Amino acid sequence: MRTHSLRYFRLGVSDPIHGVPEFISVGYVDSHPITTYDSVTRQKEPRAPWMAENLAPDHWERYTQLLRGWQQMFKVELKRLQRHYNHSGSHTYQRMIGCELLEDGSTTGFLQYAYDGQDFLIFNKDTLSWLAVDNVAHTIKQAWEANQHELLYQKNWLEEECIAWLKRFLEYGKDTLQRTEPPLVRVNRKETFPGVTALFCKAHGFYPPEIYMTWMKNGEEQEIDYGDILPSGDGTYQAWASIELDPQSSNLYSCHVEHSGVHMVLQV
């Protein structure tokens, strides 16, 4: 089994333009959305079929009530922040919590806040402390650190409860999350410029989206032009990596593709 992650986001927008919700919260297992909630629906509902089939109506009613209060909480904290900054108008407040179950059985945990797209407060579950970015953040830090039992509860949730949810959700959708579709890799060449030939290594139809593709001349690694891992829309992903050929060079290039613990080499 490879590395998996659970994530919960929160987006707070003061003075939102009509149509944009004041509060949005989405959960993720790896790259798949699993839950959703906003201030317009005021209901928490699943975003994946294998989440609705395995979670009783009890789960969604309980967390609909919980997030309604969290939405209220997020409003006053953002209002408090704008008060401290003496900020008017629209500003954003963000929060992300989650954990990862690494491949070797190891675990990680994180809890961060953001104000206007910048790192605001980062939690350190080892030292039981909050990393503050500026003076107003440090004011929030001292208030949160005064509640020592809360830091412990968050440490326990990150290291124990979050991982418990992650393993549970992995089993619910193991057909989607733990599957493997290897990439279809093809190397082609085109003359972009006069006297300039380019080699293109293109991969598509692979899942999970985690993939790394490099070009290698002989045994060494010039600069390599990379393409982003883009979602194809059918559940798979695509990416590419290109290089510029030296025509007088008698060297041989080869595309290397690694995916789900499988290394692949395409000589030219």
Epitope: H59, R62, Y63, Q65, L66, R68, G69, W70, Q71, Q72, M73, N147, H149, E150, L152, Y153, Q154, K155, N156, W157, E160, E161, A164, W165
Partner: antibody, heavy 109, light 116 residues
Framework: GQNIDQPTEMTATEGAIVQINCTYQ??????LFWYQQHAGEAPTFLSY??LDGLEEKGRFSSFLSRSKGYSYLLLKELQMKDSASYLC??????????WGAGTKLIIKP | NAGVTQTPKFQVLKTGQSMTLQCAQD?????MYWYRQDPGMGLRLIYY???????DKGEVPNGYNVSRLNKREFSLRLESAAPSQTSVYFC??????????????FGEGSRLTVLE
């Protein structure tokens, strides 16, 4: 389903030491609470444990073992006022509070 | 702060009667709860108000109703009393329902006795 077990009643003599055990089987764990409730009055908060270890505030101590699903409330230097019912409560994975039936502590003079 | 005050301290009703329990806290808490305490069992949640603008049923909500009038007040109501509703009703308030380490603050308690 979710279960919490306290001894129904315990008796000790003043000046001594009593230990009230609390074992719990819950769906997830977000902390264990101890509450004191005197006869005919309101429960008041005593302690909170979410990590393994022993927390001590004054004559009262609270220990937690998440592995064994076990906790105890330790009262040192017993006094007649300590005679009360002691409530054990656990928060489950959905932050719901499961309550034990409570332990009626009786202090003999 | 005055804590949590609930009324009435005592009450006796006939089976058909209706009655409302009042509760309010001045600690600017956002969570409000209504428990009932009975011999030989832990506290049972009747209803709770996680925030100012929402309530939900608890474990034993049959025969009860609540109305979070505002952030400061929570009221428990019985439109048709029952001998089974003879109990001691406690009102609690927490700072936030979501935060895990938060404790409860209880009211003095209301003793109800319903007779035929």
């Amino acid at each position: 389903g979710q279960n919490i077990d306290q001894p129904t009643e315990m008796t000790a003599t003043e000046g001594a030491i009593v230990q009230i055990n609390c074992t719990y089987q819950t769906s997830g764990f977000n902390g264990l609470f101890w509450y004191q409730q005197h006869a005919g009055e309101a429960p008041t908060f005593l302690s909170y444990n979410v990590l393994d270890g022993l927390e001590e505030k004054g004559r009262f101590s609270s220990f937690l073992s998440r592995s064994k699903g076990y906790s105890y409330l330790l009262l040192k230097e017993l006094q007649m006022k300590d005679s009360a019912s002691y409530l054990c409560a656990v928060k489950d994975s959905n932050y719901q509070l499961i309550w034990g039936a409570g332990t009626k502590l009786i202090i003999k003079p | 702060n005055a804590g949590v005050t609930q009324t009435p301290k005592f009450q006796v009703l006939k089976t058909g009667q209706s009655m409302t329990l009042q509760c309010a806290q001045d600690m600017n808490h956002n969570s409000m709860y209504w428990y009932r305490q009975d011999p030989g069992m832990g506290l049972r949640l009747i209803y709770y108000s996680a925030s100012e603008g929402t309530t939900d049923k608890g474990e034993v909500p049959n025969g009860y109703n609540v109305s979070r009038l505002n952030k400061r007040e929570f009221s428990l109501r019985l439109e048709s009393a029952a001998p089974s509703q003879t109990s001691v009703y406690f009102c609690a308030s927490s700072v936030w329902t979501g935060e895990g380490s938060g404790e409860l603050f209880f009211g003095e308690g209301s003793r109800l006795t319903v007779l035929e």
